[PDB]
């Protein structure tokens, strides 16, 4: 095979990238908030339908390291390819360089797959837009990045990707200071929940929160834990 | 012309959605109902064949239920032909994991693997995806019984009860009103059959058009024993539920 | 049409996709560049859009090596491929010769990567279907011709320039260069010149969290100026607008 | 059974100056006790003030020169008429050597010229790769007859100022091109007498930035 | 040394009438050193029993190799595999590595379930079908076993005449060999029940 | 329809694209080949489109092995590429069998290659007709190879714009000589029928090139005609048409 | 280049794969063929037709041997059956007679041939063979079995079936004529009778090709002296033998 | 041949000889065995002359490549394990390797690693590798202290090479001293072994088996 | 051959490895760990043929961790030893044989029972209640078989390990310069400062 699928557009664009970004619109919604001591990635699960087990359904934030997590927006099929690939890079980086992955290394890696499939004829880039966050070893500094199916990456202090990310981002502008992230763990988790309470709703059955704190601490907070923060937001 | 005759079917549409993946879901609504219900003592898989004739031999027919390994079987809804290739890739992969780790493959990994193959067809080669939907009954000791559906895009969704194929919506409303979280395999066997009786594809539901299989933890010592019933053992349960 | 092929000529006499590449530079955040014989300065815009962007870790300034700097403007999906290749090329030269690579030779190598459109033209391996969409301002100092500034196209063509501005606001920048470039500029007078032309094609308040300056100097190497220095230079420009 | 290596003898001597360099070598080619050729210099000018001699097993040594002079061409073509350094020359030869290091060469290679400081520079290579800067280095079969004597007259090794009795060493000298020509001629004439792979002719190459000179002197036929 | 006779291990098998029996020692060592007394060489797929002697890693790699193949067969035909089809399979898989050969001796012992006929076969290192209807022995003290089983046996033993002869034949060979013995296990294989019986043997 | 490639095929039993490529040969220079008793005399019109050109320095005549002349018409690069391929083939034969390749054998190998590109869509059909022949131990031969990949033995052949003019005269030449004629005399006749075939090319002026492989003069080796011999042929033809 | 590696099969927008619908049309332009499974044999039958009356039909084979106890018969295109039967023979030998050293089970073989079809709907430069095959056989593990192979690349076991352009007529005829217990002799009489209504040619044994996978024959095995080994279950009936059975209807 | 390196508080002293031989005969008296991998890393030449130099030049290529990509200077742990895997490949193809990579940084301190041709990566505060490593060890480790002055450390480096030159046939030439600090390596010149010997004999009172 | 002893007790596994490094005829280091965590509840110690051991331990560490992180579950000691056995079996066929002898001691949480394995460089996994490799193992096996009772405690097994090391010092002519001792228990992987 070599029959081109990436064809140059008369906008100075590539047809497959514009479509990938439409796919991220259809996708799920991942939100990222960096505190002064935490990163929080909360995501939308699709499980509105009744009689659906939630023990065995793949999680929308998958841990690639012990303090670097990978979350996604877009198609549910294509996201898994970057996740399995990121884990191989993690074990390769520990073999040949020693020391856990940094967020930055993985941000470049995930872009190199999208970028490689954008330029070549025979492969289309994945319709998956990602947030890579976490800590780097011997640093209590939270790192928050976004890569997109172009193969371009940019830093953020807080971010949102996926459906009606415009609406949520506008709410997060006023309740977030670049100079002053949330200095509390609690207020950071409450901030991500409020952003999710615009689009996601459904109580807490489509709301997830993973909090990552330094010292290799990834914690997953269920529907039950998340309710606790919701009521505090309602009173507020 | 080696690009004049290519149409590009590994491309997204302006929506972000693959043409061939959308069409595949249609062609799988052609194939008959297939049901998975997860009790707690097992998993019931029950499928009604999509062809029947009276000179057709249905007593040896395998066209829905296939064993990938001794704890994992699938129901097929789509083309038999398309599914077969994946079924034998599955057998190789499950046994490969047993060969190297001396441990049976968890349900998660196998499901993820077949999904990657489906995505791989749209990712490259200009190949069409095999339009298959599987309902996986699987056991592992880490999550107990696990129930899954995979779709021809290559994605998997956990379930408690689920249906694919013909009359997918109807079947699902019946499961929602009748399901308990404390159901036995017995309760789930009766629920599966009664649901197939309202989503039947002739006017009568018959034992010889049913494949029925369970995976039961009743089998001693903690083992899971898959039993694929004979149509003459499916007949027995058809009299239990009083269709007959 | 003629963009459905990879090498297919159009009545034009030249490639159509390549034109689209030139019209992908006009989607980039302006990169401006002034070369003098006292060192060469590269500035760049970043483009804030939110108080939720971290911009002092984002830059379009890149180090290819100690003695060569680069600024990129256009599609930056494409620029990642080219910058990694520039980084290898420099290191290969220093592997093979234990010597500094010329700015002209380094640029010429990156133009060879830029010509890799086609999937069946010549003998050399094609790793793309189309052209890139990004232009470069590779500045540097070599000990042969001194300070150098090259502008490299995604075409696979390069020119030596004394001053060049690429990006969205390139034409409005280039008008200011014709009247404001002269041979008796200094390093610091050049540095203020960058910000002057950048301020017009800036769509926001010109400040130090959406502009980045960098020099390449013989004796200091490649130094990326910190936002403190950028903030100072910006303020002194407003004092020379308080002279008019 | 086939052994694809042999020996063709010969001898070289490269001396780094202070604004000159001299690379000299014999024009005798042998295989054991047979004289192959009376006249056939192995000391080649390669152009641009670099001289290279790859001495020992001739077939390998020739190959190295062919490819190196090809690299001179590709340096001007692909680096845009950049003038070749001695430095740059050295590393490039090392790649041609380490490449067939598992199918080893068997030459001792020396280059000489001026570096861009405007002084002489000599680098000498072992037969698989690696080189280091030296002042004087010999190579070839008669190398160890020529070496200690050149060190005594150039670096003043194990010489002391008269009547200090090994307390004040006779400092390093100032060399001139003329002086060194005398030392080369003296040493090779001794070598012809006390070694058999040396003789028939001597060709001394002088490198400056004023040009490269080839000067021939005869040796004995024995 | 020879990588077949570096860890030893021995398997005896005899036919009876309406029965077969296979037995092995539990001794598995590396060279002179005894490593384990907790290692069984008898495996079974359906009503076929596989004993395997020779080089240790090839014992265990071939054990899982034949498991890979018989799973495929079983799921496909939805029936137990027969001793005769298993022989053919063993012969072909050993011949796959002709160069860089396997260094084992597999032993096939079962009862044909479509006639009730006891059935045994042996294989060698490159693997060839070795039919007999008296005994098949393989390993390093196979040589010893060939004399011992010949001497004791008289055609078509009873299941328990079978157990008395087969118990002896192994123990005397197995303590007459350095890399065999260290315990023993005997399967007496009938059409309907398999009894597994350990033998008290002298620790050697 | 039915020209979009060459794995299209029409209900007419024709391939259209390949017939179209014969029209490129019709736009070429005139070239002739006369099969003689003891050899072949080729001649080709070389146009003088400007006095800027350098005469008898741009050959359309490339030798293959040592005894097979090849001269063509149509698209000049495509025919030079065809002859490059066949020079590799000639060498392989000489390698394996330690003898120069025969004329029927050389034809077969070229024919498969040109035949292959009218089946694949990955490689473009030819647009050349080549006239090639020579003397080996099996006699003199003359072959004309279509871009469709057809050849035959010939007593006379032509291709180019002036193939009409050449062919008519070869009929009369076969009526002059009902077995054929000497190679020596055919030097004068190759010129003669090029000069008549320049009446569709008398808008221009031309340079006459003649090449031959003949047993009786060159000892069955392929050489060029030129010098006093060429000028005798030119004088012959000049007088005939006046 | 040669960028054909994209599939020539594609989903249709109302579901269903367009290419195999087209191939299924090619089955209904072909001859008629049928299989009746008895309890003590199988009979398979097809009609012979020729491109010229000067063509011999005594050298024309549309029933082919895959293995000794297992036969095949086609409906559809001649060319498409001709290569594909060779591939059916090939995969029985590479993967079960070089690994399991014996002739494959009927169930097993039918599955393998559907894999071959399945990769002729995948990738460019291929398109599915436009035939349906009946693979009648006997194995020693699943008994007699009668199969129908689809150009889909799916299979189904049957008790009696038909394929070809006159298939619908033939199976409705067979609907009344099939019983739980059958004789092979009665099976033959039904087979020729059913095919009389679907053949527009002669109905002589010259033009009706008949083959049974009935009881095995150890005198066609080619050796004797191992009782244990069994001979071909297949037996093609020559033209005179088929005429005797026409009088016995 | 003798190359050694030792940690202390000040960083790492790298000290090496300069005699290299070819056969019984002494090819050179001015062959540097230190390969400056970059401004913050030193490597020592031991094992094959060819292999060691080539691969430590290539390591510095890969060092620059890490530094540009991450924007931060390479980990020394990372450098050693890059070189190791590659030699392990040419394990069973015959390469000869022994280097000590020496570095000092801000996130692990001074660290020495020993890379082998078999592909070893050893941590240690001391290594002596070469043909005269046994005479280097003796005197070095008797006078070793983790608490050590930088001045004293340079004299101990000298003295270990000087011992090796005395006893070993292939060792000697000259001494090159480097003090790797956090800020990178500083070069402290070349000191001739031949003049060092008689000075130290007078100064310390050592080498009293030698006539004088 | 570097010291590598295993002793399975009835609530943990106790592994021990040699600190000495010997390449050539010279000791280069006399305090260096020769053990690496594979999983948070499985440990592998390694000894064998210089430099093969180092590389392949970091290789296996990477492989098992790839699966363990992907699925978020840690593999049983039984499974881990089988995987290692697979690579070793393959590696002797391969171009360069790998000489790596490893004791993989782990606490099975699945069955909630300690397990200890001895894997030779041939690739044969065997469960034992104690193990060893190298020549040193020759002297300790008789001690271990003397003093092992099936109801062991962690401290009795530490005390027995001290005996094995004292006997080793007498009968082996090689210095191993003490051992590192590690416990793989249900509470993690810990070190003890007893030797």
UniProtKB/Swiss-Prot annotation, chain C:
One of its GO terms (biological process) is proteasomal ubiquitin-independent protein catabolic process. Belongs to the peptidase T1A family. The 26S proteasome consists of a 20S proteasome core and two 19S regulatory subunits. The 20S proteasome core is composed of 28 subunits that are arranged in four stacked rings, resulting in a barrel-shaped structure. The two end rings are each formed by seven alpha subunits, and the two central rings are each formed by seven beta subunits. The catalytic chamber with the active sites is on the inside of the barrel. Gene3D superfamilies: Glutamine Phosphoribosylpyrophosphate, subunit 1, domain 1 (3.60.20.10). The modification Phosphothreonine is found at residue 49. GO terms for cellular component: nucleus; proteasome complex; proteasome core complex, alpha-subunit complex; proteasome storage granule. Keywords: Cytoplasm, Nucleus, Phosphoprotein, Proteasome. It is found in: Cytoplasm; Nucleus. The modification Phosphoserine is found at residue 50. The lineage of its organism: Eukaryota, Fungi, Dikarya, Ascomycota, Saccharomycotina. It comes from the Eukaryota. InterPro entries: Ntn_hydrolases_N, Proteasome_alpha, Proteasome_alpha-type, Proteasome_alpha_type_5, Proteasome_asu_N, Proteasome_sua/b. This is Proteasome subunit alpha type-5. It comes from Saccharomyces cerevisiae (strain ATCC 204508 / S288c). SMART domains: Proteasome_A_N.
From Swiss-Prot, chain D:
Gene3D superfamilies: Glutamine Phosphoribosylpyrophosphate, subunit 1, domain 1. It is found in: Cytoplasm; Nucleus. GO terms for biological process: proteasomal ubiquitin-independent protein catabolic process; proteasome-mediated ubiquitin-dependent protein catabolic process. One of its GO terms (cellular component) is proteasome core complex, beta-subunit complex. Keywords: Cytoplasm, Nucleus, Proteasome. It holds the Pfam family Proteasome. It comes from the Eukaryota. CDD domains: proteasome_beta_type_1. InterPro entries: Ntn_hydrolases_N, Proteasome_bsu_CS, Proteasome_sua/b, Proteasome_suB-type. The keyword Cell wall biogenesis/degradation does not apply. Belongs to the peptidase T1B family. The 26S proteasome consists of a 20S proteasome core and two 19S regulatory subunits. The 20S proteasome core is composed of 28 subunits that are arranged in four stacked rings, resulting in a barrel-shaped structure. The two end rings are each formed by seven alpha subunits, and the two central rings are each formed by seven beta subunits. The catalytic chamber with the active sites is on the inside of the barrel. This is Proteasome subunit beta type-6.
Swiss-Prot record, chain E:
It is found in: Cytoplasm; Nucleus. InterPro entries: Ntn_hydrolases_N, Proteasome_beta_3, Proteasome_bsu_CS, Proteasome_sua/b, Proteasome_suB-type. Keywords: Cytoplasm, Isopeptide bond, Nucleus, Phosphoprotein, Proteasome, Ubl conjugation. There is a cross-link at residue 69 (Glycyl lysine isopeptide (Lys-Gly) (interchain with G-Cter in ubiquitin)). Its main location: cytoplasm. SUPFAM superfamilies: N-terminal nucleophile aminohydrolases (Ntn hydrolases). GO terms for molecular function: endopeptidase activator activity. The modification Phosphoserine is found at residue 30. It holds the Pfam family Proteasome. One of its GO terms (cellular component) is proteasome core complex, beta-subunit complex. PROSITE patterns: PROTEASOME_BETA_1 (PS00854), PROTEASOME_BETA_2 (PS51476). The keyword Phosphoprotein applies. PANTHER family: METALLOPROTEASE TLDD, PROTEASOME SUBUNIT BETA TYPE-3. The 26S proteasome consists of a 20S proteasome core and two 19S regulatory subunits. The 20S proteasome core is composed of 28 subunits that are arranged in four stacked rings, resulting in a barrel-shaped structure. The two end rings are each formed by seven alpha subunits, and the two central rings are each formed by seven beta subunits. The catalytic chamber with the active sites is on the inside of the barrel. Belongs to the peptidase T1B family. This is Proteasome subunit beta type-3. It comes from Saccharomyces cerevisiae (strain ATCC 204508 / S288c).
Curated annotation (Swiss-Prot), chain F:
One of its GO terms (cellular component) is nucleus. The alpha and beta forms are probably products of the same gene with different post-translational modifications. Its main location: cytoplasm. It is found in: Cytoplasm; Nucleus. GO terms for biological process: proteasomal ubiquitin-independent protein catabolic process; proteasome-mediated ubiquitin-dependent protein catabolic process. Keywords: Acetylation, Cytoplasm, Nucleus, Proteasome. The keyword Cytoplasm applies. GO terms for molecular function: mRNA binding. Present with 12000 molecules/cell in log phase SD medium. The proteasome degrades poly-ubiquitinated proteins in the cytoplasm and in the nucleus. It is essential for the regulated turnover of proteins and for the removal of misfolded proteins. The proteasome is a multicatalytic proteinase complex that is characterized by its ability to cleave peptides with Arg, Phe, Tyr, Leu, and Glu adjacent to the leaving group at neutral or slightly basic pH. It has an ATP-dependent proteolytic activity. Belongs to the peptidase T1A family. This is Probable proteasome subunit alpha type-7. It comes from Saccharomyces cerevisiae (strain ATCC 204508 / S288c) (Baker's yeast). The chain holds residues 7 to 248 of 288 of the full protein.
């Amino acid at each position: 095979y070599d029959r081109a699928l990436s064809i140059f557009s008369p906008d100075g664009h590539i047809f497959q990238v514009e479509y990938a970004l439409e796919a991220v619109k259809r996708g799920t919604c991942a939100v990222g908030v960096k505190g002064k001591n935490c990163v929080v990635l909360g995501c939308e699960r699709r499980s509105t339908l009744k009689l659906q087990d939630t023990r065995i359904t793949p999680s929308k934030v998958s841990k690639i390291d012990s303090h670097v997590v990978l979350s996604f927006s877009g198609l549910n099929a294509d996201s898994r390819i970057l996740i399995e690939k990121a884990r191989v890079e993690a074990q390769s980086h520990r073999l040949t360089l020693e020391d856990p992955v940094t967020v930055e290394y993985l941000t470049r890696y995930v872009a190199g797959v999208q970028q490689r499939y954008t330029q070549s004829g025979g492969v289309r880039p994945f319709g998956v837009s990602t947030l890579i966050a976490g800590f780097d070893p011997r640093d209590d500094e939270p790192k928050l990045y976004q890569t997109e199916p172009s193969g371009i990456y940019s830093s953020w202090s807080a971010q949102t990707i996926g459906r009606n990310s415009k609406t949520v981002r506008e709410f997060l502008e006023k309740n977030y200071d670049r100079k002053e992230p949330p200095a509390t763990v609690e207020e950071c988790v409450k901030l991500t929940v409020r952003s999710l309470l615009e689009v996601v709703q459904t109580g807490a059955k489509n709301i997830e929160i993973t909090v990552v704190k330094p010292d290799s601490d990834i914690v997953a907070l269920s529907s039950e834990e998340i309710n606790q923060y919701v009521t505090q937001i309602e009173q507020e | 012309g080696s690009r004049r005759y290519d149409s590009r079917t590994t491309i997204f549409s302006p929506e972000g959605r693959l043409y061939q993946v959308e069409y595949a879901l249609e062609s799988i609504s052609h194939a008959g109902t297939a049901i998975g219900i997860m009790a707690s003592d097992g998993i019931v898989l029950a499928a009604e064949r999509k062809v029947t004739s009276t000179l057709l031999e249905q007593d040896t027919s395998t066209e829905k239920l296939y064993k990938l390994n001794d704890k994992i079987a699938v129901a097929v809804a789509g083309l038999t032909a398309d599914a077969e290739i994946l079924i034998n890739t599955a057998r190789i992969h499950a046994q490969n994991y047993l060969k190297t780790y001396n441990e049976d493959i968890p349900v998660e990994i196998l499901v993820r693997r077949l999904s990657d193959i489906k995505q791989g067809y749209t990712q490259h080669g200009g190949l069409r995806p095999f339009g298959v939907s599987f309902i996986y009954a699987g056991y592992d000791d880490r999550y107990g019984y696990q129930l899954y559906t995979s779709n021809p895009s290559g994605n998997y969704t956990g379930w408690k009860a689920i249906s694919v194929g013909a009359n997918t919506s109807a079947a699902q409303t019946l499961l929602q009103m009748d399901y308990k979280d404390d159901m036995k395999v017995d309760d789930a066997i009766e629920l599966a059959l009664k649901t197939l009786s309202k989503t039947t594809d002739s006017s009568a539901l018959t034992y010889d058009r049913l494949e029925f299989a369970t995976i039961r933890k009743g089998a001693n010592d903690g083992e899971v024993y898959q039993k694929i019933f004979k149509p003459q053992e499916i007949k027995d349960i058809l009299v239990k539920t009083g269709i007959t | 049409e003629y963009d459905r092929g990879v090498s297919t000529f159009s009545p034009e006499g030249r490639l159509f996709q390549v034109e689209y590449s030139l019209e992908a530079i006009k989607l980039g955040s302006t990169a401006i560049g002034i070369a003098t014989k006292e060192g060469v300065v590269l500035g760049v815009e970043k483009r804030a859009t939110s108080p939720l962007l971290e911009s002092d870790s984002i830059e379009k300034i890149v180090e290819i090596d100690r003695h060569i700097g680069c600024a990129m403007s256009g599609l930056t999906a494409d620029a990642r491929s080219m910058i990694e290749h520039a980084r290898t090329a420099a290191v290969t030269h220093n592997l093979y010769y234990d010597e500094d690579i010329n700015v002209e030779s380094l640029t010429q190598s990156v133009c060879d990567l830029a010509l890799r459109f086609g999937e069946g033209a010549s003998g050399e391996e094609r790793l793309m279907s189309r052209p890139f969409g990004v232009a470069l301002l590779i500045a540097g100092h070599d000990a042969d011709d001194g300070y150098q500034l090259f502008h490299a196209e995604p075409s696979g063509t390069f020119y030596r320039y004394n001053a060049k501005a690429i990006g969205s606001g390139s034409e409005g920048a280039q008008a200011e260069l014709l009247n404001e470039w002269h041979s008796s500029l200094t390093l610091k007078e050049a540095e203020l010149l960058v910000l002057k032309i950048l301020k017009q094609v800036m769509e926001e308040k010109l400040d130090e969290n959406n502009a980045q300056l960098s020099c390449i100097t013989k004796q200091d190497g490649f130094k990326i100026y910190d936002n403190e220095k950028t903030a100072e230079l910006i303020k002194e420009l407003k004092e020379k607008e308080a002279a008019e | 059974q086939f052994n694809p290596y042999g020996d063709n003898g010969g001898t070289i001597l490269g001396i780094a100056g202070e604004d000159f360099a001299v690379l000299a070598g014999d024009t005798r080619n042998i295989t054991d006790y047979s004289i192959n050729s009376r006249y056939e210099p192995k000391v080649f000018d390669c152009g641009d003030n670099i001289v290279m001699s790859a001495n020992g097993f001739a077939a390998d040594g020739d190959a190295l020169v062919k490819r190196f002079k090809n690299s001179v061409k590709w340096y001007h073509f692909d680096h845009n008429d950049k003038k070749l350094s001695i430095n740059s020359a050295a590393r490039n030869i090392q790649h041609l050597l380490y490449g067939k290091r598992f199918f080893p060469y068997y030459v001792h290679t020396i280059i000489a010229g001026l570096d861009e400081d405007g002084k002489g520079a000599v680098y000498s290579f072992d037969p698989v790769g690696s080189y280091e800067r030296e002042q004087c280095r010999a190579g070839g079969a008669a190398a160890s007859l020529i070496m200690p004597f050149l060190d005594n007259q150039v670096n003043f090794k194990n010489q002391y100022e008269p009547g200090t009795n090994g307390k004040v060493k006779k400092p390093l000298k100032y060399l001139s091109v003329e002086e060194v020509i005398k030392l080369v001629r003296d040493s090779f004439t001794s070598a012809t007498e006390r070694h058999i792979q040396v003789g028939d002719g001597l060709e001394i190459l002088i490198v400056t930035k004023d040009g490269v000179r080839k000067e021939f002197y005869e040796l004995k036929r024995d | 040394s020879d990588p077949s006779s570096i860890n030893g291990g021995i398997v005896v098998a005899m036919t009876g009438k309406d029965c077969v029996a296979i037995a092995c020692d539990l001794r598995l060592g590396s060279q002179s050193l005894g490593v384990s007394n907790k290692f069984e060489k008898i495996f079974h797929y359906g009503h076929v029993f596989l004993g395997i002697t020779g080089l240790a890693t090839d014992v265990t790699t071939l054990n899982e190799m034949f498991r890979y193949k018989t799973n495929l067969y079983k799921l496909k035909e939805e029936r137990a595999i027969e001793p005769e089809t298993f022989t053919q399979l063993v012969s072909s898989s050993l011949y796959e590595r002709r160069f860089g050969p396997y260094f084992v001796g597999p032993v096939v012992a079962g009862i044909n379930s479509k006639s009730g006929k006891p059935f045994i076969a042996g294989f060698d290192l490159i693997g060839c079908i070795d039919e007999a209807k008296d005994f098949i022995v393989s390993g390093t003290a196979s040589d010893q076993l060939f004399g011992m089983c010949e001497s004791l046996y008289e055609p078509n033993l009873e299941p328990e005449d079978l157990f008395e002869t087969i118990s002896q034949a192994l123990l005397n060979a197995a303590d007459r060999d350095a890399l065999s013995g260290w315990g023993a296990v005997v399967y007496i294989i009938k059409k309907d029940e398999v009894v597994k019986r350990y033998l008290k043997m002298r620790q050697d | 329809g039915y020209d979009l490639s060459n794995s299209v095929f029409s209900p007419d039993g024709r391939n259209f694209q390949v017939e179209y490529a014969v029209k490129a040969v019709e736009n070429g220079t005139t070239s002739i080949g006369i099969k003689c008793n003891d050899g072949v005399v080729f001649a080709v019109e070389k146009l003088i489109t400007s006095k800027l050109l350098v005469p008898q320095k741009n050959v359309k005549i490339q030798v293959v092995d040592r005894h097979i002349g090849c001269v063509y018409s149509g698209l000049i690069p495509d025919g030079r590429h065809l002859v490059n391929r066949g020079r590799e083939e000639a060498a392989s034969f000489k390698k394996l069998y330690k003898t120069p390749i025969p004329i029927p054998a050389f034809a077969d190998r070229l024919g498969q290659y040109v035949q292959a590109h009218t089946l694949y869509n990955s490689v473009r059909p030819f647009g050349v007709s080549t006239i090639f022949g020579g003397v080996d131990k099996n006699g003199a031969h003359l072959y004309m190879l279509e871009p469709s990949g057809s050849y035959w033995g010939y007593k006379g052949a032509a291709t180019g714009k002036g193939r009409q003019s050449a062919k008519a005269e070869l009929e009369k030449l076969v009526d002059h000589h009902p077995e054929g004629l000497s190679a020596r005399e055919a030097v004068k006749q190759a010129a003669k029928i090029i000069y008549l075939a320049h009446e569709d090319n008398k808008e221009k002026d031309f340079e006459l090139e003649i090449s031959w492989c003949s047993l009786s003069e060159t000892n069955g080796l392929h050489k060029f005609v030129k010098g006093d011999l060429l000028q005798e042929a030119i004088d012959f033809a000049q007088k005939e048409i006046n | 280049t040669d960028r054909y590696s994209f599939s020539l099969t594609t989903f249709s927008p109302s579901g269903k794969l367009g290419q195999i619908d087209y191939a299924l049309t090619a089955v209904k332009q072909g001859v008629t063929s049928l299989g009746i499974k008895a309890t003590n044999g199988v009979v398979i039958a097809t009609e012979k037709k020729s491109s010229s009356p000067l063509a011999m039909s005594e050298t024309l084979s549309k029933v082919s041997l895959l293995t000794p106890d297992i036969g095949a018969v086609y409906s559809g295109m001649g060319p498409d059956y001709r290569v594909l039967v060779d591939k059916s023979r090939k995969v029985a030998h590479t993967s079960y007679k070089r690994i399991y050293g014996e002739y494959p089970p009927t169930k097993l073989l039918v599955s393998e041939v559907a894999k071959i079809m399945q990769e002729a709907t995948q990738s460019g430069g291929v398109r599915p063979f436009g035939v349906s095959l009946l693979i009648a056989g006997h194995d020693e593990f699943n008994g007699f079995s009668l199969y129908q192979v689809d150009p889909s690349g799916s299979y189904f076991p049957w008790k009696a079936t038909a394929i070809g352009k006159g298939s619908v007529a033939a199976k409705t005829f067979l609907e009344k004529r099939w019983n739980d217990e059958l004789e092979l002799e009665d099976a033959i009489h039904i087979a020729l009778l059913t095919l009389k209504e679907s053949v527009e040619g002669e109905f002589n044994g010259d033009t009706i090709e008949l083959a049974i996978i009935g009881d095995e024959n150890p005198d066609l095995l080619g050796y004797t002296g191992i009782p244990t080994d069994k001979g071909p279950r297949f037996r093609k009936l020559t033209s005179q033998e088929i005429n005797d059975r026409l009088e016995a209807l | 041949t003798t190359t050694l390196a030792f940690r202390f508080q000040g960083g790492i002293i790298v000290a090496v000889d300069s005699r290299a031989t070819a056969g019984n005969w002494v090819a050179s008296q001015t062959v540097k065995k230190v390969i400056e991998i970059n401004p913050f890393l030193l490597g020592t030449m031991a094992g094959g002359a060819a292999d060691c130099q080539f691969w430590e030049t290539w390591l510095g290529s890969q060092c620059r490549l890490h530094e540009l990509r991450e924007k931060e200077r390479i980990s020394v742990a990372a450098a050693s394990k890059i070189l190791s895997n590659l030699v392990y490949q040419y394990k069973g193809a015959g390469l000869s390797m022994g280097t000590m990579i020496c570095g000092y940084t801000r996130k692990e301190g001074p660290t020495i690693y020993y890379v082998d041709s078999d592909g070893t990566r050893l941590k240690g505060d001391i290594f002596c590798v070469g043909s005269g490593q046994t005479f280097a060890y003796g005197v070095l480790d008797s006078n070793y202290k983790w608490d050590l002055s930088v001045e004293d450390a340079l004299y101990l480096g000298k003295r270990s090479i000087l011992a090796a030159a005395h006893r070993d046939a292939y060792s000697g030439g000259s001494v090159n001293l480097y003090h790797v600090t956090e800020d990178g390596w500083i070069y402290h010149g070349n000191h001739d072994v031949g003049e060092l010997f008689w000075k130290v004999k007078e100064e310390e009172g050592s080498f009293n088996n030698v006539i004088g | 051959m570097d010291i590598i002893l295993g002793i399975r007790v009835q609530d943990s596994v106790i592994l021990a490895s040699s600190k000495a490094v010997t390449r050539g005829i010279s000791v280069l280091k006399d305090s260096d760990d020769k053990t690496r965590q594979l999983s948070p509840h499985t440990l592998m110690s390694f000894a064998g043929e210089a430099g093969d051991t180092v590389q392949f331990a970091e290789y296996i560490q990477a492989n098992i961790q790839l699966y363990s992180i992907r699925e978020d579950y840690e593999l049983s000691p039984q499974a881990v030893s089988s995987f290692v056995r697979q690579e070793l079996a393959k590696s002797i066929r391969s171009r360069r044989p790998y000489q790596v002898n490893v004791l993989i001691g782990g606490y099975d949480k699945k069955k909630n029972k300690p397990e200890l394995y001895q894997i030779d460089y041939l690739g044969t996994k065997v469960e034992l209640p104690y193990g060893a490799h190298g020549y040193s193992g020759f002297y300790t096996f008789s001690l271990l078989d003397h003093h092992y009772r099936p109801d062991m405690t962690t401290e009795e097994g530490l005390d027995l390990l001290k005996l094995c090391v004292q006997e080793l010092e007498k009968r082996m002519p090689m210095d191993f310069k003490g051992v590192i001792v590690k416990i793989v228990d249900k509470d993690g992987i810990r070190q003890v400062d007893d030797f």
